[PDB]
Amino acid sequence: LVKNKCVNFNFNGLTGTGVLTESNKKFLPFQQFGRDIADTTDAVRDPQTLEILDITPCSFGGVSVITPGTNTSNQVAVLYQDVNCTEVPVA
């Protein structure tokens, strides 16, 4: 497994896309994958080390351009709606 990287995970019995991160929430010894409101896969327990991993949807958002105006200049500035600065050059 790879942590803190967007990957197409295929865990035991369930398939989906997202990111894998370190967990703090603790499961019960008989449970497999967690959930939250609206019944979406929020966390998955590792079958190997009995560890838990949270699942976050892949980073996405709409871009936006800061333009002072054609008649005043040509410089622009591009804005992504909600993205960490580390993973901007993906697309």
Binding site: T40, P57, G61, D82
Partner: peptide, 25 residues
């Protein structure tokens, strides 16, 4: 402020912050 309680990110839905933050309001 403390008397109001329950807006989460999802697959295709987002939430944009207001222009005027709470402190400036």
């Amino acid at each position: 402020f403390n008397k109001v309680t329950l807006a989460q990110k999802f697959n295709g839905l987002t939430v944009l912050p207001p222009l005027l933050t709470d402190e400036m309001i």
